[PDB]
């Protein structure tokens, strides 16, 4: 079991790279419109507290440089959206994939292209953490490589990257340019909440395992919603709703678990650790794997 990403042909031919004047990144280039981290206006004295607006009007349609690898684009309008520009271009990407902007939900999991200077260099997945972070892996240069998930034909965008926090994980905004959480671009000290675990995740992570059959953890107990959600508290992890006990209902059928048993399996595990076993061959309890991957990955 692992986690796997989407097939990220789709958003390769995307990628391209914007720079202005001696500051570059990455941008998504879909029909005639370049999307990238506003950012890429800024110099290194501007960090601590940029004025957007104001740097914006020392900046002409021909102070924005697009490289689509070799194909060189001309900029023919732009403007700010929240913390994203969109850079208007003579020419539709021919390799615009069908697709959609979507603002995700804390749990949901995508999808991430990591991109330096326009060129993709890497896929992995990952998840919207419920304090609206991501634990992302990206270095220098990798602003404006995005978050994705596909759907049969339809690439949804969900996360286009900004920044890493001083912790090290990693915070950017929808395809709109609204940050996710409470974030804003600009190098001040911004301290993350509570790194809580997602419950609804980890519970479809242990019927993937019984799935695949590991099944030690299941032990003789149910429990309650409320009995739970007080066990949940003390362990930092997400309540659990009868809506996504609802979603677990595919997983409870196909197993045969109930979803409060599974629950009071996990609440044991909670209480007494895995005593040196694994489970789906980790040594912790997983929350990057939705309801919607485990179906995915197991049928
Ligand atoms: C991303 N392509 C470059 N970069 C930044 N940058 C780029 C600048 C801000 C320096 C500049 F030229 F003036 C504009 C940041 C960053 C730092 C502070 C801040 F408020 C924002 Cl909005 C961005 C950054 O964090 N990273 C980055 C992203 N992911 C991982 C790492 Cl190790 C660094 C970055 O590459």
Same mark, same amino acid.
């Given at each position: 079991f692992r986690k796997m990403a989407f097939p990220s042909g789709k958003v390769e031919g995307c990628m391209v790279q914007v720079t202005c004047g001696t500051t570059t990144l990455n941008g998504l280039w879909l029909d005639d419109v370049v999307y990238c981290?506003?950012?890429?206006?800024? &110099?290194?004295?501007?960090?601590?507290?940029?004025?957007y607006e104001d740097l914006l009007?020392?900046?002409?349609?021909?102070?924005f440089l697009v490289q689509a690898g070799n194909v060189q684009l001309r900029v023919i309008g732009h403007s700010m959206q929240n913390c994203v520009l969109k850079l208007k271009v003579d &020419?539709?990407?021919?390799? &615009?994939?069908?697709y959609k902007f979507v603002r995700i939900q804390p749990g949901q999991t995508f999808s991430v292209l990591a991109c330096y200077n326009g060129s993709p260099s890497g896929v992995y997945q990952c998840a919207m953490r419920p304090n609206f972070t991501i634990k992302g892996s990206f270095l220098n240069g990798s602003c404006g490589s995005v978050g994705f998930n596909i759907d049969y034909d339809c690439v949804s965008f969900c996360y286009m990257h900004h920044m890493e926090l001083p912790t090290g994980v990693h915070a950017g905004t929808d395809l709109e340019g609204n940050?996710? @959480?409470?974030?804003?671009?600009?190098? &001040?000290?911004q301290a993350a909440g509570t790194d809580t675990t997602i419950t609804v995740n980890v519970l479809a992570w242990l019927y993937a395992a019984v799935i695949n @059959?590991?099944?030690?953890?299941?032990?003789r107990f149910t429990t309650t919603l409320n009995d739970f959600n007080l066990v949940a508290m003390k362990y930092n992890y997400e309540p659990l709703t009868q809506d996504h006990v609802d979603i677990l209902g595919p997983l409870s059928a196909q197993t045969g678990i109930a979803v409060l048993d599974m629950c009071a399996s996990l609440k044991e595990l909670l209480q007494? @650790?895995?005593? @040196?076993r694994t489970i789906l061959g980790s040594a912790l309890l997983e929350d990057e794997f939705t309801p919607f991957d485990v179906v995915r990955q197991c049928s």
């Open positions: 981290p506003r950012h890429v206006i800024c &110099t290194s004295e501007d960090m601590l507290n940029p004025n009007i020392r900046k002409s349609n021909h102070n &020419t539709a990407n021919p390799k &615009t994939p069908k940050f996710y @959480g409470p974030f804003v671009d600009r190098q &001040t000290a @059959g590991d099944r030690w953890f299941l032990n007494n @650790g895995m005593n @040196g």
